[PDB]
C-alpha cells in the first residue's frame, strides 16, 4: 500500500523515494521484487524529502531506477520457535537448507530491545557443562558470554558439538549456531559434521538451529545476520523458557561487517577504519545476551583475533563482554586430553569463591597450584628427575600427572567417532571427584586409571579392570 521508487543505487546503498507522504520508519524493512529475487532493504536514514536511504541485504545487481519498492511495514521478521530447529536459514528468514518452507508459527522483528536493568537476574550462577576440565578450572557462566580462543584443528567443532550434546542432556536446552561471516567451506564441513554427530538429526529433533551467513553475502546481510540469530535465541529463552546456547562464530566478523556498513553509510571513518558506532553496535549485541527471570541465553563466542593482534579496537571491544576464556590448545591436545582445554590458560571471571563456593574455589586453587608446580617443575624434572625434588614435591608431581589424566573426560559426541562412552560428570560430582584425588585417596591407583574416565568411581572401576 505504501510504495516508493528506487532513485539511486550506488553500491549497496539504495535511495528509495516515497511519494506517499507516509514514509517507512527507521529500521523498517522494505522489499523489492526482483526477477530471481526478493531484495530486502533496511531503512537506515530518513534523508527527508520523503527519500529514505536504505542498506541492501541481498545483492544490488541489475536494479533499474524507478523500481517499485513495497514497505513490509516493520523490521525484518524471522521465523522463530521449535520449527526452526534443524533448518539453515539465511538472514532474511527464508530456509536455505532446501528442506522446503520452515512452516513456523510466529516471526519476530530482528531488532529487539535488550532486557531492562530491573528485568536482569541479580545473581550469578554457573552453567554446568559437565565437561570435567571446563566445570573445574574454567566454569561456564550461566547466560554469560564465554570466549572460545583457538582456531580450528584444536577440535573446535568437536568441542562445540560436545557442548551442544551436553546442554541438550543436562539442561534440556536447544542451541542456535550462528555462522556470522563464516567461510563457506567451514560451513559445509560444520553442517556435515553436525549431521554426522547427529546433533542435527534430519528425522526427529535437532538440538541446534543453524543460521548461516556466508561471507559471500553483501555487507548489510553479514551485519544483520547476527541479530537474526539472536532473535531466535531470544524466543527460546522467553517463550520456551530454556537455557539456550548461542554459538557465534566469530565476533571479529560482527565488528568487521559493522565497519563496512558504517563506511557505506558515509559516517566519517573512525580509528583504524572502525565504525564510530562501534560501542553501541556491540552494546546492542551483547546486552540482548543475558540471564533473565525467563531463562538464559549463554553465548559461546569464538574469537579469531585479526593478525594475532588482540589490542586492535575490535578485540578490545570484544573482550569487554567476555566473562570467561576457554583456550583450546595444540599443546594440550598433544598430551591427548579430550577436549584440549588448557587448565592454566582458561580463565573465568566466575572462577572466584563467591560464585563457585569457597570449597570449590579452594579445590580449584589447589588444583591450579598442583598443576602449575608440575609445569614449572617439569623443566627441573627433565634435567635431574623428580627424585631430586623432595618426596612431598614428588607426590605433587605424580599427582599432577594423575590430575592431568583425570582432566580428560571422554566425549559423548566422540561415541560416534572414536567410540569412547560419553561421561557428563555432574558439577558437584566433579568437584568431589577431584577433591578426593587432592586428598590423595586415589593417589595409589595407576595414572592410566585416570586417563579418559568419568567420575571417581569410574577411576576405581578402571583401576580394577587395569589390574584384571
Amino acid at each position: 500500500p505504501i510504495t516508493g521508487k528506487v532513485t539511486a543505487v550506488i553500491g549497496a546503498i539504495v535511495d528509495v523515494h516515497f511519494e506517499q507522504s507516509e514514509l517507512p520508519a527507521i529500521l523498517n524493512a522494505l522489499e523489492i521484487k526482483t526477477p530471481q529475487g526478493k531484495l530486502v532493504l533496511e531503512v537506515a536514514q530518513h534523508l527527508g524529502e520523503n527519500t529514505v536511504r536504505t542498506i541492501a541485504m541481498d545483492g544490488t545487481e541489475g536494479l533499474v531506477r524507478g523500481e517499485k519498492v513495497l514497505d513490509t511495514g516493520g523490521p525484518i521478521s524471522v521465523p522463530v520457535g521449535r520449527e526452526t530447529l534443524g533448518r539453515i536459514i539465511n538472514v532474511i528468514g527464508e530456509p536455505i537448507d532446501e528442506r522446503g518452507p520452515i512452516k513456523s508459527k510466529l516471526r519476530k522483528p530482528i531488532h529487539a530491545d535488550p532486557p531492562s536493568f530491573a528485568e536482569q537476574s541479580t545473581s550469578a550462577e554457573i552453567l554446568e557443562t559437565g565437561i570435567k576440565v571446563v566445570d573445574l578450572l574454567a566454569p561456564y557462566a550461566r547466560g554469560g558470554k564465554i570466549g572460545l580462543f583457538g582456531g580450528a584443528g584444536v577440535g573446535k567443532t568437536v568441542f562445540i558439538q560436545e557442548l551442544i550434546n551436553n546442554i541438550a542432556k543436562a539442561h534440556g536446552g536447544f542451541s542456535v549456531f550462528t555462522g556470522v561471516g563464516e567461510r563457506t567451506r567451514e560451513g559445509n564441513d560444520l553442517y556435515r559434521e553436525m549431521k554426522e554427530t547427529g546433533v542435527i538429526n534430519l528425522e526427529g529433533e535437532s538440538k541446534v538451529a543453524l543460521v548461516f551467513g556466508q561471507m559471500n553475502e553483501p555487507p548489510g546481510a553479514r551485519a544483520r545476520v547476527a541479530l537474526t540469530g539472536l532473535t531466535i535465541a531470544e524466543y527460546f529463552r522467553d517463550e520456551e523458557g530454556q537455557d539456550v546456547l548461542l554459538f557465534i562464530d566469530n565476533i571479529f566478523r560482527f565488528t568487521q561487517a559493522g565497519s563496512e556498513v558504517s563506511a557505506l553509510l558515509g559516517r566519517i571513518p573512525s580509528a583504524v577504519g572502525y565504525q564510530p558506532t562501534l560501542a553501541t553496535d556491540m552494546g546492542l549485541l551483547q546486552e540482548r545476551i543475558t540471564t533473565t527471570k525467563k531463562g538464559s541465553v549463554t553465548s559461546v563466542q569464538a574469537v579469531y583475533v585479526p593478525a594475532d593482534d588482540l589490542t586492535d579496537p575490535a578485540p578490545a571491544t570484544t573482550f569487554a563482554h567476555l566473562d570467561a576464556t576457554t583456550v583450546l590448545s595444540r599443546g594440550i591436545s598433544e598430551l591427548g586430553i579430550y577436549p584440549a582445554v588448557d587448565p592454566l590458560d582458561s580463565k573465568s571471571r566466575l572462577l572466584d569463591a563467591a560464585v563457585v563456593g569457597q570449597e570449590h574455589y579452594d579445590v580449584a586453587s589447589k588444583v591450579q597450584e598442583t598443576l602449575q608446580t608440575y609445569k614449572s617443575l617439569q623443566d627441573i624434572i627433565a634435567i635431574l628427575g623428580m627424585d631430586e625434588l623432595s618426596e612431598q614435591d614428588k607426590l605433587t608431581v605424580e599427582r599432577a600427572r594423575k590430575i592431568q589424566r583425570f582432566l580428560s573426560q571422554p566425549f559423548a559426541v566422540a561415541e560416534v567417532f572414536t567410540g569412547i562412552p560419553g561421561k557428563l560428570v555432574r558439577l558437584k560430582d566433579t568437584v568431589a571427584s577431584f577433591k578426593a584425588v587432592l586428598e590423595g585417596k586415589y593417589d595409589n591407583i595407576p595414572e592410566h586409571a585416570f586417563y579418559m574416565v568419568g567420575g571417581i568411581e569410574d577411576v576405581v572401576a578402571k583401576a580394577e579392570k587395569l589390574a584384571a
Binding site: 530518513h46 534523508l47 536511504r53 536493568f117 530491573a118 550469578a124 554469560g144 560501542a279 546492542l284 569487554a320
Partner: protein
Amino acid sequence: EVSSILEERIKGVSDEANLNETGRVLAVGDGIARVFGLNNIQAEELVEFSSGVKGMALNLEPGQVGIVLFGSDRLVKEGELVKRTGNIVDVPVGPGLLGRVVDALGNPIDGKGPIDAAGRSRAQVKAPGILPRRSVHEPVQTGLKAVDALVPIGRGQRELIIGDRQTGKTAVALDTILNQKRWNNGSDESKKLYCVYVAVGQKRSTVAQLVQTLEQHDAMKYSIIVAATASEAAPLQYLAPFTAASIGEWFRDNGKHALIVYDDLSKQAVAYRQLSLLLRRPPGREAYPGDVFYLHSRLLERAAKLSEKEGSGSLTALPVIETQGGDVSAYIPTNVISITDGQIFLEAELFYKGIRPAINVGLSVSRVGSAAQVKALKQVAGSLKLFLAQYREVAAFAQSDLDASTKQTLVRGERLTQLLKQNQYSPLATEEQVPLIYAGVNGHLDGIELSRIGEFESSFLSYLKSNHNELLTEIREKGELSKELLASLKSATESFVAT
C-alpha cells in the same frame, strides 16, 4: 492488586498541555535529527519528540537545530512533532539519591520508587575557583595497605586508578567503597564520605553484580550508582559523568564529603567520539574529538576540597582509566594523566602472577600523597617505601652468586611483597594496618617463612586484639604513634613472633 496500581497510574494521567514551541523533523539519520522549528532553544536544551524520545540540542545550526537523540532512531521518524521541554540538562540532586541506582535521566532503574528529589541542578556547572579551594589534609582510608601507605589518599583531590583492560580494575575501586563503610557507620559527618559509583559503558549484567555486591555488604545507604550501561544510548553515555558530577555537587555544596569514582573515562571518551563524529564536528587525533581534552578537564576539575569560608566540604574523585593494552602514551590516557594529579598504576604482569592488588609501586605516585595520611601510618611507613624500592632493584639479581647484602634485601623484600597481598572485597581498619606494617619494617617477618606470612597476618591481628585491643584503640583514637606505643607495640610483636 495489579489492577489497582495500574488504575492509579491511569488516574494519574491528567491535564492538558499549553504547547507553544514545536518542531518537525526534517531528516533523521544516524541519531542526528535536524529539526525545523525550535526557534528559541537553549544550548543543550532537552527536547521531547512525539515518540517520547528525549534529546539534547548540542548543535544549534543556522537554519536547523541538530538534536542528538537520547533514545533509539527506531521510534523517531521524519516530520515528527518535537516539543521543546525548555530546560537545559538537569538531574535530581538531594539526599534522596542515597541508596538509589538511577539512570542518567534520574529514573530509578532499581525501581525503588520516585527519587526524593530536593533540587534539579544543571549537568554542566563550572568548577570551584582558585580562592574557593583550600588545601587538602583530611585523610581518606582505602583499607588497602598499599594504597594507604604507598599512595595515601586525601579529600577533594583526584588520582588515577589506571591499568590494563579488565584486570579487575573495577574490583580495586569497589574495595575503596567498602572501606568507607567503617567511617560511614560512624555518626560524625566529618567521617562520612557518601560514595558515588559511575558505571560507564558497563554491561547490565556487570552492574547487576555491582548492585548485588553492594547490597550484600549493605553499602547501599551511602551509595548512589549512576548507570549508563552498554546498551544505553551514546548521548546518555556522553552526559553520564557530567550528570553524575552534579549529584556530587549537592554533597559538596552541603559541606559533606563524598568520593565519586568515574569508571572508566575510556568509555566516556568513546561516547564523545561517537557523538562528535556523528554530528560531523571536525575529527582530531586518534579520531577522538578535538576538544576531548577540554571535556575531560571540565569533568576532572569539578573535584574540589572547599575552603572553610565556602564551608569545608570536599568531592574526592578517583577516575579509573583503562589502558588499551598498556599504551600510556595513547591520546586519551596521556591527556588524563596530565589533567589529574597522582596515578596508581596497576600492572597486568603482577595480577597474573597472583599479586592482587596488582599495584605497581614504581608506577604509582601521589602528588598530594602524604599531605593527607594518618600521622601514625606515616611514621611507620617511610621505611616501607624505601624497602620496596630496594627490593625492586635487587629483584633481578636473583639470577646465583648472591652477596650477603643482596640476600638480606631479598628476604625482607619478599616478605614485604607477600604482606601487601590482600583479598579483594575485604577492607581493613587503620588500627590494623599500622601493626602489620610495623612488623615488616622492624624485620620481624623476615624470620617468618613466606608460606607462613599469610597465617602470621591474621594471627598477629587476633593476637594484637587479644593481648591489647587497648593498643589498637589507642592507635585508633590517638592517630599518632607515641614512643610508648611504639615501645609497647614492639614488645607485643616480639611476643607474637615468639608464638
